[PDB]
Paper text:
Glucosidase I removes the outermost α1,2-linked glucose from the D1 branch, and then glucosidase II (GII) trims second and third α1,3-linked glucose residues by catalyzing hydrolyses at the Glc-α1,3-Glc and Glc-α1,3-Man glycosidic linkages. Here we performed an X-ray crystallographic study of GIIα to elucidate its substrate recognition mechanism. The overall structure of GIIα is composed of four major domains and three subdomains: N-terminal domain (residues 31–384), subdomain B1 (residues 207–256), β8α8 barrel domain (residues 385–737), subdomain B2 (residues 484–526), subdomain B3 (residues 559–581), proximal C-terminal domain (residues 738–823), and distal C-terminal domain (residues 824–977). Taken together, our structural data revealed that GIIα can recognize two kinds of glucosylated substrates, Glc-α1,3-Glc and Glc-α1,3-Man, via a bilocular substrate-binding pocket with a tolerant +1 subsite.
We expressed the recombinant GIIα (residues 31–977) in Escherichia coli and crystallized it by the hanging-drop vapor diffusion method. The crystal belongs to space group R32 with one molecule per asymmetric unit. The final model of GIIα refined to 1.40 Å resolution has an Rwork of 15.4% and Rfree of 17.5%. The tris(hydroxymethyl)aminomethane (Tris) molecule derived from the crystallization reagent, also known as an α-glucosidase inhibitor, was accommodated in the putative active-site pocket located at the center of β8α8 barrel domain. The Tris molecule was bound to the pocket in the 1.40-Å-resolution crystal structure. Similar to DNJ, it interacted with Asp443, Asp556, Arg617, Asp633, and His691 through hydrogen bonds. The α1 helix covers a β sheet comprising β12, β17, and β18, and, the preceding 11-residue-long segment is accommodated in the putative active site pocket of β8α8 barrel domain, suggesting its involvement in substrate binding. A unique subdomain (termed B1) is found in the N-terminal domain of GIIα but not in the other GH31s. In subdomain B1, residues 215–235 are completely disordered, suggesting its flexible nature. In this domain, a continuous twisted β strand (β43) connects the β sheets with β42 and β44, forming a β-barrel-like structure. These C-terminal domains appear to be responsible for the stabilization of the β8α8 barrel domain rather than for substrate binding, given that no interactions between these C-terminal domains and the active-site pocket were observed.
Residue numbers in the entry: 29 to 214, 236 to 898, 902 to 977
The structure:
Amino acid sequence: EFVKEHDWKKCDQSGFCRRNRAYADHALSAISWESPYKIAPETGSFKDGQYQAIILKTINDHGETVRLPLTVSFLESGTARVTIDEEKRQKGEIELRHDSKARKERYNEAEQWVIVGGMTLDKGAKVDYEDKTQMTVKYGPSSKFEATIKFAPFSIDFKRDGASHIKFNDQGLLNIEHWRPKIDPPDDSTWWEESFGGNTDSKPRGPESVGLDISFVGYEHVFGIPSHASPLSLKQTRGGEGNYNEPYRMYNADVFEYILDSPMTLYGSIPFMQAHRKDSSVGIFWLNAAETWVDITKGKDSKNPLALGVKSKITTRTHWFSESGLLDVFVFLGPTPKDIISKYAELTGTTAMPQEFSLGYHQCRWNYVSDEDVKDVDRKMDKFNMPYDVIWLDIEYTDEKKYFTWDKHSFKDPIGMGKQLEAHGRKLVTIIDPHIKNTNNYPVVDELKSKDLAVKTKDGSIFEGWCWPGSSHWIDAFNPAAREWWKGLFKYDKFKGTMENTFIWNDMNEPSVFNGPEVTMPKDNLHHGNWEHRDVHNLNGMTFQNATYHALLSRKPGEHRRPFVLTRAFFAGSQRLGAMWTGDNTADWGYLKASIPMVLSQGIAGFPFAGADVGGFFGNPDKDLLTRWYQTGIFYPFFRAHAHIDARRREPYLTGEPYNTIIAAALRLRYSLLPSWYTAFRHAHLDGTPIIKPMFYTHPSEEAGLPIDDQFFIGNTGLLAKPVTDKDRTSVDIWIPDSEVYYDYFTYDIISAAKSKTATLDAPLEKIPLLMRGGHVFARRDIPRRSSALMKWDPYTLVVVLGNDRKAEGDLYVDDGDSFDYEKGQYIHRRFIFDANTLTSADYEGRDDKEGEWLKKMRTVNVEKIIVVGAPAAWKGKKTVTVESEGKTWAAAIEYNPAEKSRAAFAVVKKVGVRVGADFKIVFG
Ligand SMILES: [Cl-]
Ligand SMILES: [Cl-]
């Protein structure tokens, strides 16, 4: 590695963070503090779902003002948007220092990058009341939501169900740093040039941060703003036992040996926060791409939040501030977690339909050293009956760190290697990063430069800095021209050695710059549009993943298929583009434990296709740690083992017995559940539903679930997992959320019924703690195969899990896994309902029964086995069920097994013989 001992700005070393914390400190200390911002009421108009007005900020004691245009939008979804800009900058009436050509206006293209829907204004929104001091707009479903805009001082309260839920500027922390010239007087130490990390930011605009206090009234838990090594329920940041002392930071960065339990930034940022309490949820999305900090405090609503004499109800106070751009905030009023995340996904995108194979097990390290190493690992996985889908090539596969090349010594036959993988339906993933080596005899860099596709410096020169290849330039993927050029580099006939099973890993896209400040670009670099790097930093990774995504749609004439791209850096909207992982984690138990809250936070922030490196990246995991890590990793939506260059080889067959057998059983469970995992991804695509779901999401009425972040439900299955993540543990305590019956997935032991509680479950090394909730049906594939592609035509097993209602529902989505034919209806989506002794299968969307090639071939694929857990006693002695499908009726044998000790009664129907694409009805009893 280049950097050994890294320097990260603490809040006090970030000028605009210092200024905004100081602004908060002053406002909280001041007596009868009034925000110096007022709506000029005569400038206001409401029409057709939108309020527009001028906020006047008073900027000195003479009462001089600047004009800050306000726009409040009320969207058909019931979401609201509040935007504040700065008129002098809209007009261009400022002067940038240093003869800079940077844009004068406040960055206003975050919307262009992030927002894909949800923007229709609600012409049903209406002013309920309006005088010279305030106005209330009714909006949302049946006009149930209200926003009360107070003019002087400016504030907005967002209300429903007879209460305020979210307040803007209640504490008076609104801060829009208006443009000023650099003048010596007739505290400005952070206003202009700032130095850190071996770099001086020329700061041509001076101060321009935007900040606001957002209060969540009556909420004691807030969630989101990934990525951090931190609990799902976010910590306070202004001190106290078990709290942080610095704000959560979002400034995508390459953080060497990142630590646990910290508000420090990691590699990606999604500035979306939710607040949840029993039966009420709200949220905000802060649409800003610049460095952003969020302070969080909790206490009573009184100015001294520890005062006596006041009601105890807790308000969570949050203080958001970004270096530049618009103040631009979306407000979600729920009332459930599912509602909020759905509405957020309508705005920023749902999860892309994945390549099916990408849900399988990925095998990676730094590095497989040759094409022969790759082919050998492939063979050994099969020798050891460990299924996997993809083998990965880290940076040593390239010729001297030039992307779009292969090391000729070590990778002489990449097509041969590809074809070997293709023999089991397996894939290859190759790393490609945004740093393009600055060297002679390299057409990729020649074109990057001559076509003006590289990121620029403060004076418009091509930026140069160091990364893996040494001296490099960076693709400016903000430029559509750069994205279009990038597409051309990936065609199979151009990127020699690649073929139809080759997909792509994007890394170091924060961007990582080894000699740059905080290992990234200078803030005064310039991008396409003449935006400063400060304006757009948190978007950078996403623009690069975007470029690569679009490059993989078609790589030869007539091809049109789903990309698979892994990214390190990301933003709101990256869910449209592929997977993420949590970067360079460490081979230790605390990082295994921490992975679960991190991966959960990803999904509730609308980017669920997420995982952590299995085994941990840095170091050498003990055999038990590695084994437990597989048992956790099979529940990551993105499931990959990876290891640092100095770490011992740890392909899973190297572990030794008994670990090999336990790891193989974990892999087989992941594969068996693939039908249900894929269906979970379908729901993420349809409406932004998380793939693995925390308790707050599934059980919004159960208050005790709010701080729980070590257990989760899988998709739409009712499967409740709590992996073991502690050394030498041989049992686990699972929180049972409700009064439903819960069954051990493996033994059908009844773990709980009738009442929410904590249950202790035996959990030796060989146990994966996994429960099945009553009321659910899920599909699996029992026949073990070497890869997901080799399962494609195999029969399904349905597991029907009954509680006392003897009623259940679930679903199964299947398609060709690769094309966009799903857009034209070429898929199977079954809704399974058990009710009144009958299991039925119907099309999920109610479509009437034109079959393409894939649908036709699926006519050979059946449901063959049904297992009913919690089978009623009345079925005892009955030797058949009656099956009806496609006009034919027949008996199928059923085996009834009575309850025994704590094991549930269960019944098994074998050789059901019904095609999965057809309606059916099966009557029991
Ligand atoms: Cl002005
Ligand atoms: Cl749910």
